[model samples]
Target: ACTKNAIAQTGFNKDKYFNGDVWYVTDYLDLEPDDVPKRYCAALAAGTASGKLKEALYHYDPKTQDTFYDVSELQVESLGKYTANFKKVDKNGNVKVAVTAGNYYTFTVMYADDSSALIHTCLHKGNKDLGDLYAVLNRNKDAAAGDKVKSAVSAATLEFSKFISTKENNCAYDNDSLKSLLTK
Candidate 1:
């Protein structure tokens, strides 16, 4: 249950990464298949607002038509490693569930550049701990997972071929909403 302590990016550029831009999840690998669905879509906007590190997330299940948003305040554990406390929110940033002690996620940037990144996340909601989720992200939603990030996946001891690509799921994103949620 999200046990692996993935390595962080060496000399990660925090300023460039948290530049108030959106990064779409192009492909994902869930070590434990129980929680993560076979077909899903997710995206996030990371930025510092009012001097606070913040990130807004959007998740959608294509087959079930389920959609949810989360706004998180991140606290750094080390370079490229953070503990995020999240609040479930609406597309317009209205709080649906307030942040509680047991609701948080550990995030580590395994690799990143201007256009692409590989990240690891473990979400803890209530008393249940979810599986390890590794995602390949791109600044452009339609961009494919490039070689650099794919190689990072291999470094993480994972097979890129096993990751599910969200490109074929007819995924859609509310870009404006995700950006605005950063400061909410």
Candidate 2:
């Protein structure tokens, strides 16, 4: 007349069966260090009380209607783990700068929703010593940097400058400060 809660850990997913009903992790916050990135492969919440799914990944099922977190692709609060502070510079609305760790060069550049344009500035602004790394690698390889690296540092910087041009990103042709950072 009653069913059992069959519990077993196969791989990344669970196998739980209880009286013809499945139990979901009711609250992700209940777990230790749950907020750490990729720590807990799954999480849960009872939907938002005041229009919020605050701390858990949401899952929607269309076939047999098992509406639990059947996925972690929902990307909940991942910005803190991998991104840095990017702010707009004064005097010009389009100019942007980084005031964060990782890049100590006070990198000057521009950005937008296009997304591809931001990569070079990411390399330029930081104290990651990437440019130096490029130089070192090139010095060791001599003229065969192409054999060691997919492209030499100069090649990479060239590609970055082409795509990272401020004028192409902006609606203006008279961008002085924006161009000045790259002029030298």
Candidate 3:
């Protein structure tokens, strides 16, 4: 039940947004309460490889010690909107789960700058829709949200205080693997 049809950032710059750099999810707001881990760390790198728009993702649950990676090929829906078909992969680009029907997520860039961004995503796996998840992204994992990104959150009609912060989660990322996975 992904309810909101979020508006894309005005005059979004796709080239800059996909410049082969990792964006860390510093905070997140999930509409549904039960479908996802309450405390987790996530980051992603976006870039075009051999003319294909691709994204590499990393997720970790701090308390449970769970971790996973995924590589996705994105098909553009509009200027800043995409439908991504993802395959679960390991850190070394080994596929653990192949892409299948309904194994996708819809991504929309609500706001983005050089160091900060706000995004919306809805995940669909099999017959289940995981509802809406909004994230505040920063180039540095420990960086606090800047004014522009926070304003974008309010522009989306959401309270920044309600979002969960990942700063103190004892999270760590394999920077090398994330960059290398971009070509997978």
Candidate 4:
């Protein structure tokens, strides 16, 4: 499955290390889970508080309105042990901003092309850990292992709380370029 020419440049590594109890496995599906971006409203929220934020997915729908819809469900999936990097917050256009807190993954889906096509993905950091999601979402015991891992983290430390505070009330997209169009 490693479609490569060399060895040191290994395409995959599954040796995971975590501080928790163990589970057994026999068969395996060696797949690089596709991190397709979720809907705009969902992805924007996701960008604000992920420990490792992948770019949010984008799309376009002609049947659109200025009002938001009821996001009754937030689907989460699992990937094996992974790495997350915190460089800075999501950028607006060419100008990037400084973010010293949690990870973010905001972007847009076009036609209108904006994040306020409005779905946000930021969640608390403690919630990012698999064990935490499993601990809280008791019902997920019947769900996929990945779903449990991707469940919304309830909250994080008070210090961590300060940075993500702005998102509690709304999607924290800082894309100034879209403002003019969004209001139209």
User: Model 1: what TM-score?
Assistant: 0.98
Candidate with best lDDT: 1
Tens-place lDDT per residue, model 2, 77-156, is 22211122333233232334434454331111111111111111112244332231111111111122132222222334
TM-score (C-alpha) between model 2 and the true structure: 0.15
Clashes of each: 0, 4, 0, 18
Error of 4 at 23 (Å): 28
- Per-candidate Cα RMSD to the true structure, in Å, reads 0.7, 25.4, 0.8, 18.5
Which residue pairs show collisions in model 2?
A: 103-126, 103-127, 104-126, 104-127
Lowest-scoring 10 consecutive residues by lDDT in candidate 2?
A: 12-21
For candidate 1, the per-residue lDDT at 107 reads: 96
Q: Which stretches of candidate 3 lie over 4 Å from their true place?
A: none
What's the lDDT of the predicted structure labeled candidate 4? 0.20
TM-scores for all candidates: the values are 0.98, 0.15, 0.98, 0.18
Model 3, 52-163: lDDT tens digits are 9999999999998889999999999999999999999999999999988789999999999999999999999988888899999999998999899999999899999999
What range of 10 consecutive residues in model 4 has the weakest lDDT sum?
Answer: 110-119
- Better by lDDT, candidate 4 or 1: 1
- lDDT against the true structure, each candidate: 0.94, 0.20, 0.93, 0.20
Q: Candidate 2: where are CA atoms >4 Å away?
A: 1-86, 92-98, 102-171, 179-184
